[PDB]
Amino acid sequence: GLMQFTLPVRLCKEIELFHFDIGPFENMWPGIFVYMVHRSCGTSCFELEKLCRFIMSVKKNYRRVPYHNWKHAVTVAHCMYAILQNNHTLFTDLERKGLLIACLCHDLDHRGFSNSYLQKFDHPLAALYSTSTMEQHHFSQTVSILQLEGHNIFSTLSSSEYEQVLEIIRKAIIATDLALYFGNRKQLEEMYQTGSLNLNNQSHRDRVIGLMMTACDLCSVTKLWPVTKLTANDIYAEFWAEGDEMKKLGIQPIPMMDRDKKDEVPQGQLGFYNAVAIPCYTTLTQILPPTEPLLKACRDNLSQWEKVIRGEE
Numbered sequence: 001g002l003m004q005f006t007l008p009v010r011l012c013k014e015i016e017l018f019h020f021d022i023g024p025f026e027n028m029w030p031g032i033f034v035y036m037v038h039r040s041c042g043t044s045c046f047e048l049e050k051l052c053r054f055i056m057s058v059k060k061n062y063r064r065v066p067y068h069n070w071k072h073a074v075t076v077a078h079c080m081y082a083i084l085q086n087n088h089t090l091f092t093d094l095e096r097k098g099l100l101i102a103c104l105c106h107d108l109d110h111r112g113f114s115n116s117y118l119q120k121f122d123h124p125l126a127a128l129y130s131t132s133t134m135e136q137h138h139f140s141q142t143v144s145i146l147q148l149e150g151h152n153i154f155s156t157l158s159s160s161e162y163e164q165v166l167e168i169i170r171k172a173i174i175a176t177d178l179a180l181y182f183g184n185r186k187q188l189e190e191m192y193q194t195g196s197l198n199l200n201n202q203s204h205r206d207r208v209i210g211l212m213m214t215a216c217d218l219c220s221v222t223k224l225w226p227v228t229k230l231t232a233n234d235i236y237a238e239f240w241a242e243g244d245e246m247k248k249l250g251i252q253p254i255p256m257m258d259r260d261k262k263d264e265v266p267q268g269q270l271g272f273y274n275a276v277a278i279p280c281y282t283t284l285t286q287i288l289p290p291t292e293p294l295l296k297a298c299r300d301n302l303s304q305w306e307k308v309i310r311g312e313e
């Protein structure tokens, strides 16, 4: 009850900032997550015994892949923590509960391969889930873990609040399918500009939470340059492995995934920043002004990639 998580001074201060890196000490990440739940939601919203057991089962169901791993899960949860803490009064109690858990669970049992590779491989999951293949699997894995004995962290919610929070988590995890991001942001851009955007309109909130999920999911591009640059290695380690597996199916992979075309990564990063990341954080800053530091950090990293091409690094 009166058992608070407390971080060392540097972490206590820096965890509040959007560009916080959770560090290389894996055994501190569960504590970092509980700390964020306690401060973002309250010391009462989850039973610590059940939360701790849920966290360790979620950890166990992330794989030993270069990028789509347990560290990514906690990193994405921290970006969501930073957004919720900088927008105190905009979100309900259930939303704050749902979204931290959604971010922690959003890539459960990821194998480091895209929806495209599963379909071309003809993986069983592609027959079970025709669109947002891995994202439907991630939500399925979340419900499975919630249903383990002693793992239902929502047990003390009413029946309607329980159905609401599982609905929040489902939409939040589906929204991390980047194929859905393009149309979601376009609609939000139209609604903001025409002035029709209404946060009391449930379908509008859903769209805003989807954009928050894209923003947290892509947040490696909002870190200090050395973190962004070193995370890019892990991201491209998976892309190149997938490229290898495409060549084994007798398919030339797109340049993004071809380890022979390593030279084209810097220009590939420019396209991603300009087509995905900058537009994402721009629209997010328009709807939620206090998230502006994510856009500023993203712009700084675009400028660093431009310097890489110009041979200045």
Ligand SMILES: Cc1cc(=O)c(-c2ccnn2-c2ccccc2)nn1-c1cccc(OC(F)(F)F)c1
Pocket (backbone or CB within 6 Å): 178, 179, 217, 218, 219, 220, 221, 235, 256, 268, 269, 272, 275, 276
């Ligand atoms: C090429 C590229 C470079 C990157 O740096 C990143 C990236 C930065 C942060 N996260 N993240 C990321 C996100 C999903 C999976 C793996 C990594 N993403 N892409 C990327 C990924 C999927 C589709 C895609 O084409 C699209 F979006 F245009 F359809 C582009």
Ligand SMILES: [Mg+2]
Pocket (backbone or CB within 6 Å): 106, 107, 134, 176, 177
């Ligand atoms: Mg994902």
Ligand SMILES: [Zn+2]
Pocket (backbone or CB within 6 Å): 072, 076, 106, 107, 176, 217
């Ligand atoms: Zn992710």
